[PDB]
């Protein structure tokens, strides 16, 4: 009776094993666009993915992670609200059973079909396991997905999902360029928060891009064919792997843009 996204083990249950679920800086949150303040002092955001080295794709039983070589400064996030250098370790998505839900963050209560999380760790802490124990350990770039035109740069991801249908399956996934998942504009909102999955650690500087990317209905349908279960277990479609918005408490959301 491990955590998940079902009636008996979903987000409303997580606080029993993970009391930080009711903490002071939980994610996601609703972004109230009229309350977010422009912060002219945010430095420009720097997303440097030219030398990124993807390795593998893994179905971990709650999402799929595209993993990178993070043993050198190859793919880094800098600038914006951040002090120092954050290294890309993985990306994953959260998505819905239907196009009208799936994102974790909301914008004026609007839900997107899905949300991409590009996860980076602060190099001053040496490794990801140490970084998640620090209040400035991670920087996550959050990107909304809406259903419309296909995203060409997503198709290589979509096409390998049949090979990692069930929990614990992985596949080689080299030479994937995450620049093909970014929208035109880097305008963003930022606030201090948490992992959206257990263990819900309060270690994340969230950087949520305002401009969504468009994916096709056929692309997100292939996400929804994944399974939460292992091979030879009863089939449970991997859908609605999102946590709903949490109380903002004593936080301010800052905007990079007027
Ligand atoms: O899903 C996770 O475990 C996660 C991990 C790192 C950063 C963000 C998230 S939401
Ligand atoms: Zn996530």
Residues closing a segment before a gap in the chain (C–N exceeding 2.5 Å): none
Question: What span, in angstroms and rounded, lies between the C-alpha atoms of 192 and 1?
Answer: 30
SS3 1: coil
Handedness of CA 79, 242, 247, 213 (dihedral sign): positive
DSSP symbol at 212? P
Q: At residue 142, what are phi and psi to the nearest 5 degrees? A: -105, 130
Q: Which residue has the tokens 């030398």?
A: 51
Q: Which residues are part of the catalytic machinery?
A: 62
How crowded is the C-beta side of 150, counted as CA atoms within 13 Å? 11
Q: How many domains does the chain have?
A: 1
Task: Please count the residues of the chain.
Answer: 258
Spatial separation of the C-alpha atoms in residues 146 and 148, rounded to whole Å? 6
Q: In terms of residue numbers, what domain contains 113?
A: 2-258
The Cα 29–Cα 246 span in angstroms is 5
The binding site for substrate comprises: 196-197
Method used experimentally: X-ray
CA distance 220 to 226: 11
Token pair listed for 34: 């009229």
Nearest listed ligand to the Cα of residue 140: 1
- In DSSP terms, 67 is beta-bridged to 56, 90
Phi, psi (deg, nearest 5) at residue 143: -130, 125
Please give the Cα distance from 136 to 117 (Å, whole number): 17
The β-bridge partners of 205 are: 139, 192
- For residue 71, what are the contacts with CB-CB under 8 A and spacing of at least 6? none
For residue 91, the Cα-to-chain-centroid distance in whole angstroms is 6
- Could you tell which of 63, 121, 193, 195 is best to mutate to test the pocket of ligand 1, judged by most ligand atoms within 8 Å of the CB? 195
CATH code for the domain in which residue 127 is found:
3.10.200.10
């Amino acid at each position: 009776h491990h955590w998940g996204y079902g009636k008996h083990n979903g987000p409303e249950h997580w606080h029993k094993d993970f009391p930080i679920a009711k903490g002071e800086r939980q994610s996601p949150v609703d972004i109230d666009t009229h309350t977010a303040k422009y912060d002219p002092s945010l430095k420009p955001l720097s997303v440097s993915y030219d030398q990124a080295t993807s390795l593998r794709i893994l179905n971990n039983g709650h999402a799929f992670n595209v993993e990178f070589d993070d043993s050198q400064d190859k793919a880094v996030l800098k600038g914006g609200p951040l002090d120092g250098t954050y290294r890309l370790i993985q990306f994953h998505f959260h998505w819905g059973s239907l196009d009208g839900q799936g994102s974790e963050h909301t914008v004026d209560k609007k839900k997107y079909a899905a949300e991409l999380h590009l996860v980076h760790w602060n190099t001053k802490y040496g490794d990801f396991g140490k970084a998640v124990q620090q209040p400035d350990g991670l920087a996550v770039l959050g990107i909304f997905l809406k259903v419309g035109s296909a995203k060409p740069g997503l198709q290589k991801v979509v096409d390998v999902l049949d090979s990692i249908k069930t929990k614990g399956k992985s596949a080689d996934f080299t030479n994937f360029d995450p620049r093909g998942l970014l929208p035109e504009s880097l305008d963003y909102w930022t606030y201090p928060g948490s992992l959206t999955t257990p263990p819900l650690l309060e270690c994340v500087t969230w950087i949520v891009l305002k401009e969504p990317i468009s994916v096709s209905s056929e692309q997100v349908l292939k996400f929804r064919k994944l399974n939460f279960n292992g091979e030879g277990e009863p089939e449970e479609l991997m859908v609605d792997n999102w946590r709903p918005a949490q109380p903002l408490k004593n936080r301010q959301i800052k905007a990079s843009f007027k």
